[PDB]
RNA sequence: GAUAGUGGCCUACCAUGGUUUCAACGGGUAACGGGGAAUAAGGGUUCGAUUCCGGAGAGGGAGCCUGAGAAACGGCUACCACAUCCAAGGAAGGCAGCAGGCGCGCAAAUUACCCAAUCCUAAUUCAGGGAGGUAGUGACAAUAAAUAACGAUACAGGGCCCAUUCGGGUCUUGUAAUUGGAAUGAGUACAAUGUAAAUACCUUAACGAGGAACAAUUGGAGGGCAAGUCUGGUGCCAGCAGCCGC
RNA sequence: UGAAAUUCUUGGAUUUAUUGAAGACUAACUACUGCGAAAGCAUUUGCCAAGGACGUUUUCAUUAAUCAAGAACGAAAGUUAG
RNA sequence: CCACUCGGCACCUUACGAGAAAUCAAAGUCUUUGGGUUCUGGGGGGAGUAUGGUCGCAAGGCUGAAACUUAAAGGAAUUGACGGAAGGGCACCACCAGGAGUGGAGCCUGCGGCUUAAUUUGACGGGGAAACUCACCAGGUCCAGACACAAUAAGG
RNA sequence: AUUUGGACAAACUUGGUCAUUUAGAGGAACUAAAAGUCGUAACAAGGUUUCCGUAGGUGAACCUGCGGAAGGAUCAUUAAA
């Protein structure tokens, strides 16, 4: 488990051009900053 | 900006190899998907800006004369030049001459050069650069000549000049000074080290300012005929220039020289 | 000398030994050891906190009284660390027992009933036992297996032989939210059994379906790898994402 | 030298001839080969000390094979001191 | 020189056999898998890098990682497509011997451009030309539309 | 009650050392789903036997010494069959 610090518009360029939807998190157990992908939500409307 | 930049990129994707395949125009552009590259190449081919050479197991793309000048227009969008294109006055051998206009609205002259795959384009480029440098040499020496604007890789854009050739010019009032001018100017040519052998009636162009002040000039366009004085046959070339001036002034202007005209041995103590 | 008792266990006095590439000694362990567990044609690989046996500890160290047996934590004493009440003088404390709370984290149950079993303790048949048993919570795993089964009709076929043609029956399909009479538990519940008392199970009077809803879901349909030559939108969040990708 | 320019030469270069000094190499012969544990070794002659193969009706009678530990040698280049 | 025998450095065939192949008398006697023994490697980078130890005056040597990153990096063999090699035809839509010339003057005629209200439209269009042909403009006009179906009727 | 000396020995203080949780403060470097600038972007092309060890000068690059390897394409021409 962790706490969302940011929403990230990562970019995948070649050969597939897509806008990856990710989230920078700080984990609760460690104090460790980890980015992670979030699927199926184009809006990230379930995430703040 | 962007589509012209990618068309400049595939222009720069020509100075890598010979006849360029499809995936090099895919990847030199470096665009997003199949869409932009393939639909751009189809827009090229349907406007005859590109052609397909399918040599066995090998697709390739053949650029004709069409899909270049846009980039030159883009190259001339950079250098403040022409906005509107097309008015045919003169279809020459090694160039096609058009009357064009800028954003500012002044009419100019667009000589496109057509002299394939690299060599037609590149030899038109060498011809345009060579003529631009010769124009630069003539204007640097101070010869009255049209002022060059630019040489967009193989298309020379220059000024328009209000002149008409001497075949439709009956005479002027100051005929012996015109003869002294057309002697002393070939003298100045020999003092440059060059002889323009085609010094004919159709070459010499006169602008006409007024009828009282008499402040006018001349325009001399003999570019694939100028020959250095060191060559084998320059003697009678100089003499053909002098004698065509003299036979025209005897036939048209009915003027015979009272001072003797310059010879090549006269002008050997020049430059 | 000390001990219950050998023994450098310790003390005095002597020697200068002891271990080691057949790996001593030091270091690490997210190491309690084993019976065992998972997985395989064989040989092996990886786990074993965890129901049985043995060890160790009761916040960390130490010391001790009593007693056959303790260096005992539901016994004491002191220090260290926390922490409780207080009229400020003093006084009490150990849930790694059964329940339960905070904290921690991906991660884990009821502050229930009972000694009727199984055993154990005592002065003892009777008293006591969160040991243990019972029930709740419980999709940790494991076993068994409801969500429908028969007809008649038509209609479309197919096949079997008689077809000279009709039609004579035997099957088997498909449908037709067409029709018929049946069967039964999920559930509710007199009672009885069950049990320490119950709850539940096994029985059983009385109800309980056409089930157009006592409604089965979870992941997929390019290839690996069973399944679309289908339609619409997308094609400015979109050739896209275990791998290859079009 | 693809091309060209610095240097030396009228007191004479370069080249020619007769000499002398220094240090380094050991061609052609030189493979269709030889030796050495490898690196490596090509002029003559001598000294020293080894070595392989061959031959043996000589001797000893398992003394052996491969080798962590350890040990010698090791082209070229490079360090210090003559 | 001939014949034999050891012990070498090399050669040349084959394939019985091996190997992915080039090839190999060992790189054979290996799934029908075991003569003895030493050392080394486990996809590619990061990296022979960092740190520690040791050896050395120095240069360096030996020993030697991880984090992180990635679907290939490779080994052998095989084909012809962008070879800008040279050689012949064999031609007056090429050159030399020339002849007639065009582009030089005026005009006819086809295209482009401009202009327009249209200068209709193609790249000779049998496109020779006031009407037609006309395919283009300025206008003015007819004739639309079946059957079904609600009304309306022969004095309309 | 108090008290001498012993062994057992919890702890406490003082330093000095590693091993850390930190907080702060000081600096340095890496990045951009960031944005504008000049330098060689909007510029020309160029080198191309390949390597190995060692030494040197270097510059955006890379060259030169010394010694090895082929992981480089043996034609002809003497003889043989």
From Swiss-Prot, chain A:
Family that this chain belongs to: Belongs to the universal ribosomal protein uS12 family.
Modified residues (3,4-dihydroxyproline): 15
Subcellular location: Cytoplasm
Gene that encodes it: RPS23A
Effect listed in the UniProt record for changing residue 16 to A: Lethal mutation
Biological role stated in the UniProt entry: Component of the ribosome, a large ribonucleoprotein complex responsible for the synthesis of proteins in the cell. The small ribosomal subunit (SSU) binds messenger RNAs (mRNAs) and translates the encoded message by selecting cognate aminoacyl-transfer RNA (tRNA) molecules. The large subunit (LSU) contains the ribosomal catalytic site termed the peptidyl transferase center (PTC), which catalyzes the formation of peptide bonds, thereby polymerizing the amino acids delivered by tRNAs into a polypeptide chain.
Post-translational modification: Hydroxylation at Pro-15 affects translation termination efficiency. The stereochemistry of the 3,4-dihydroxyproline has not yet been determined.
Top-level taxonomic group: Eukaryota
Lineage of the organism: Eukaryota, Fungi, Dikarya, Ascomycota, Saccharomycotina
Species annotation: Saccharomyces cerevisiae (strain ATCC 204508 / S288c) (Baker's yeast)
Stated name of the protein: Small ribosomal subunit protein uS12A
Covalent link Glycyl lysine isopeptide (Lys-Gly) (interchain with G-Cter in ubiquitin), residues: 7
Assembly and oligomerization: Component of the small ribosomal subunit (SSU). Mature yeast ribosomes consist of a small (40S) and a large (60S) subunit. The 40S small subunit contains 1 molecule of ribosomal RNA (18S rRNA) and 33 different proteins (encoded by 57 genes). The large 60S subunit contains 3 rRNA molecules (25S, 5.8S and 5S rRNA) and 46 different proteins (encoded by 81 genes).
Additional notes on this entry: Present with 10600 molecules/cell in log phase SD medium.
Curated annotation (Swiss-Prot), chain B:
GO MF terms held by the record: ATP binding; metal ion binding; protein kinase activity; protein serine kinase activity; protein serine/threonine kinase activity
Enzyme nomenclature, EC number: 2.7.11.1
Location of the active site: 198
EC class (word): transferase
Subunit architecture: Component of a late pre-40S ribosomal particle, composed of the 40S ribosomal proteins and the non-ribosomal factors DIM1, DIM2, ENP1, HRR25, LTV1, NOB1, RIO2 and TSR1.
Family in the record: Belongs to the protein kinase superfamily. RIO-type Ser/Thr kinase family.
Name of protein: Serine/threonine-protein kinase RIO2
Species whose genome carries this gene: Saccharomyces cerevisiae (strain ATCC 204508 / S288c) (Baker's yeast)
């Amino acid at each position: 488990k962790g706490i969302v610090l940011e929403k990230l518009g990562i970019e995948s360029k070649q050969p597939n051009s897509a806008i990856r939807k990710c989230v920078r998190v700080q984990l609760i157990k460690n104090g460790k900053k980890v980015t992670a992908f979030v699927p199926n939500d184009g809006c990230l409307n379930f995430v703040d | 900006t962007d589509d012209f930049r990618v068309l400049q990129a595939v222009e720069q994707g020509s100075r890598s190899h010979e006849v360029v395949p499809t995936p090099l125009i895919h990847q030199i552009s470096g665009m997003r998907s199949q869409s932009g590259t393939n639909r751009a190449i189809s827009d090229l081919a349907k406007l005859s800006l590109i052609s397909k050479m399918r040599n066995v197991k090998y697709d390739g793309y053949r650029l004709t004369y069409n899909g270049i000048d846009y980039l030159a227009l883009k190259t001339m969008l950079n250098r403040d030049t022409v906005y509107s294109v097309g008015n045919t006055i003169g279809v020459g051998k090694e160039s096609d001459i058009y009357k064009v206009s800028d954003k500012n609205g002044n009419p100019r002259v667009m000589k496109i050069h057509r002299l394939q795959g690299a060599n037609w384009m590149h030899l038109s480029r060498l011809a345009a650069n060579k003529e631009y440098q010769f124009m630069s040499m003539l204007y640097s020496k101070g010869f009255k000549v049209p002022e060059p604007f630019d040489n967009s890789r193989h298309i020379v854009v220059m000024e328009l000049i209000e002149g008409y050739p001497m075949r439709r010019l009956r005479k002027h009032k100051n005929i012996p000074k015109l003869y002294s001018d057309l002697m002393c100017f070939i003298v100045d040519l020999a003092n440059s080290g060059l002889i323009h052998c085609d010094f004919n009636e159709f070459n010499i162009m006169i602008k006409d300012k007024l009828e009282d002040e008499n402040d006018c000039g001349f325009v001399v366009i003999d570019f694939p005929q100028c020959i250095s004085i060191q060559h084998q046959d320059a003697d009678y070339y100089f003499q053909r220039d002098v004698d065509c001036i003299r036979r025209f002034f005897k036939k048209k202007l009915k003027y015979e020289p009272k001072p003797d005209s310059s010879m090549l041995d006269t002008e050997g103590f020049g430059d």
